[PDB]
Amino acid sequence: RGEVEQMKSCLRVLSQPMPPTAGEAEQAADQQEREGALELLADLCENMDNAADFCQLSGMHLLVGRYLEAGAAGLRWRAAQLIGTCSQNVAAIQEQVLGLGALRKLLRLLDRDACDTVRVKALFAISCLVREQEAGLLQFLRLDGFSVLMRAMQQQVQKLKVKSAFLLQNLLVGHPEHKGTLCSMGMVQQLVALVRTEHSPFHEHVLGALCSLVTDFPQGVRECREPELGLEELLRHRCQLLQQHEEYQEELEFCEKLLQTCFS
Amino acid sequence: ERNVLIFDLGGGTFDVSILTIDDGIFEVKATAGDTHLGGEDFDNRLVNHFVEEFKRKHKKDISQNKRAVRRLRTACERAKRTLSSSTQASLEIDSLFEGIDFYTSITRARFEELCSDLFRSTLEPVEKALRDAKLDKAQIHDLVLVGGSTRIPKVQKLLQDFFNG
Ligand SMILES: Nc1ncnc2c1ncn2[C@@H]1O[C@H](COP(=O)(O)O)[C@@H](O)[C@H]1O
């Protein structure tokens, strides 16, 4: 398609090494030209095929090694974004990105980048790599993933909070074996911390995870009965706020299933 | 005398063909199919389910923004595939409409419910090629699947159940 030619066109643009210590209007220009080529690659890569062809063209290599580690935050998050877009729910592209050891660069970025946007697109990339992707979930746990995660929930960055809750809910569904290592890590307390925040959509995911940690798992049910948390008073006051609302149905199913197995 | 059934489910069309191979001669003996059945079709069943789901949770209809509907569909195709190994998948689509970040899940089971009819209509062509080949399912010695969308568990199960094993 003209897509292959067009992305190979972006690739061309992304390959040209950085200018010879050029001037202002030569840096902020050379950059915008890459921000652009990287965005265009994202839109093209939303489609499995394109992203596939992107990998064939050694594209994923130039992305993980060189750009993720760029100097400009702008080039960084757009690269994370692209890395995410290509991999999302596609085993083969996940495996290759995984193999180039991105998760480690991604996790690093997530845990300590000066631009909240880079941290957010990184978490996005990470999620797109370990969800429903076994080999990626392992490289993740081995990289202390649940700790880079939780520290994110603790960040004063909404998108990080929602994105983190969203991924934990996923991970908990396909792998209930981790319930324990999570509770003992104090994730219940943390999750509950996010509930006490201003209600918004992502709460469905928070209560969603919380609900799994408690499912056939007394250690977790114990975590929720903890008096200090006051999780009960909290979930009943919420159970009542989500009533005639259809846009919060799944939260109410979760919020209730919780009460029903931790307070009777 | 050997009857091989070729079941080809691609991204746009579904084609079945009963091929006999005897005496070292391969001969196509019958052909059937539906030109409005394919992977693309299954995708849109998921697209609709979410566009509707998105009306419920965000009080907004994304139907008329085709750039957004396309992203949704490309995302769905990715999920539909994941749903061939996993028993469920999740979708993360940043700024899908009016700057809203979209998050959702779907279970292999749910996927199937939404595609029930489409799934059962793939047999129609099989049965027809069987009549047109003046053969009975019981004679098909081999079943080979070709076409990305022949990996969908529910597809091979409907097929396999047809030939009672
Ligand atoms: N593992 C899979 N499970 C379900 N559908 C798939 C799978 N792999 C590919 N497809 C679909 O098959 C179609 C492409 O078929 P083909 O042109 O024969 O390669 C697309 O709609 C794909 O999304």
Parse chain A into domains and list their residue ranges.
1-264
What is the rounded CA–CA span in Å between residue A217 and residue A35? Answer: 47
- Closest atom of ligand 1 to CA, residue B42: 21
Task: For residue B87, say whether it is annotated as part of any ligand binding site.
Answer: no
Helix axes A73-87, A102-111, angle to 10 degrees: 130
What is the rounded CA–CA span in Å between residue A103 and residue A109? Answer: 10
H/E segment holding residue B88:
strand B88-97
User: Residue A139 is encoded by which pair of tokens?
Assistant: 């490289």
The closest residue, in CA terms, to atom 3 on ligand 1 is B81
Helix (H, G, I), strand (E, B) or coil at B20: strand
Which residue is it, tokens 């259809």?
Answer: A246
What is the rounded CA–CA span in Å between residue B4 and residue A64? Answer: 46
What is the rounded CA–CA span in Å between residue A11 and residue A56? Answer: 12
Q: Contact B90/A131, CB-based, under 8 Å?
A: yes
Q: Contact A46/B71, CB-based, under 8 Å?
A: yes
- Strands B3-9, B14-22: parallel, antiparallel or unpaired by DSSP? antiparallel
The closest residue, in CA terms, to atom 10 on ligand 1 is B148
The set of long-range contacts for A181-187, using a CB threshold of 8 Å and a minimum separation of 24, is A181/A146, A182/A146, A182/A213, A183/A213, A183/A217, A183/A219, A183/A220, A183/A223, A184/A219, A185/A146, A185/A147, A185/A150, A187/A146, A187/A150, A187/A213
Q: Contact B85/A132, CB-based, under 8 Å?
A: yes
User: Residue A206 is encoded by which pair of tokens?
Assistant: 């928070």
CATH 1.20.1250.20 fits B1-37+122-165, yes or no: no
| B154 within ligand 1 shell (Cβ under 6 A) | no
Residue B18: CB atoms within 10 Å: 22
Assess contact for A87 and A43: CB atoms under 8 A: no
Q: What is the DSSP string of B27-39?
A: EEEEE--BTT-SH
What is the rounded CA–CA span in Å between residue A211 and residue B122? Answer: 39
Pick the closest to residue B95 from A32, A152, A85, A49 (CA basis). Answer: A85
> Can you say whether residue B138 is alpha, beta or left, with left for phi > 0 and alpha for psi between -120 and 50 degrees?
alpha
What is the rounded CA–CA span in Å between residue A15 and residue A3? Answer: 18
Contacts of A247 in chain B (CB under 8 A): 56-59
Domain ranges of chain B: 1-37+122-165, 38-121
What is the rounded CA–CA span in Å between residue A81 and residue B94? Answer: 9
What is the rounded CA–CA span in Å between residue B6 and residue B16? Answer: 6
Task: For residue B150, say whether it is annotated as part of any ligand binding site.
Answer: yes
CATH architecture of the region A1-264: Alpha Horseshoe (1.25)
Method: X-ray
| B153 within ligand 1 shell (Cβ under 6 A) | no
Task: For residue B67, say whether it is annotated as part of any ligand binding site.
Answer: no
B38-121: CATH topology is Actin; Chain A, domain 4 (3.90.640)
CA B126 distance to own-chain centroid? 15
Helix (H, G, I), strand (E, B) or coil at A68: coil
Ligand 1 mutation target, pool B76, B81, B122, most atoms within 8 A of CB? B81
- The CA distance from B136 to the nearest CA of chain A, in Å, is 39
Residues 6+ positions from B80 with CB-CB distance below 8 Å: B39, B42, B43, B46, B111, B152
Write the DSSP symbol of residue A100.
T
User: Residue A247 is encoded by which pair of tokens?
Assistant: 């846009």
Write the DSSP symbol of residue B152.
-
What is the rounded CA–CA span in Å between residue B51 and residue B60? Answer: 9
Which residue is it, tokens 């489910």?
Answer: B9
What value, to the nearest 5°, has the Cα angle with vertex B73 and ends A107 and B59? 90
Residues 6+ positions from B15 with CB-CB distance below 8 Å: B6, B8, B31, B32, B33, B125
Burial group, residue A134, by CB count within 10 angstroms (0-12, 13-18, 19+): middle
Helix axes A134-141, A145-153, angle to 10 degrees: 80
Phi, psi angle pair for B152, to nearest 5°: -55, 110
What is the rounded CA–CA span in Å between residue A27 and residue A25? Answer: 6
Assess contact for A68 and A106: CB atoms under 8 A: yes
B16 at the A interface (CB within 8 A)? Answer: no
Assess contact for A161 and A110: CB atoms under 8 A: no
Assess contact for B13 and B33: CB atoms under 8 A: yes
What is the rounded CA–CA span in Å between residue B89 and residue B79? Answer: 6
Write the DSSP symbol of residue A63.
I
Task: For residue B82, say whether it is annotated as part of any ligand binding site.
Answer: yes
CA A199 distance to own-chain centroid? 20
Residues 6+ positions from A178 with CB-CB distance below 8 Å: A141, A146, A171, A172
- CB nearest A89 (choices: B71, B82, B103): B82
- CB nearest A46 (choices: B74, B88, B101): B74
User: What single letter denotes the amino acid at residue B89?
Assistant: A
Give resolution in angstroms: 2.9
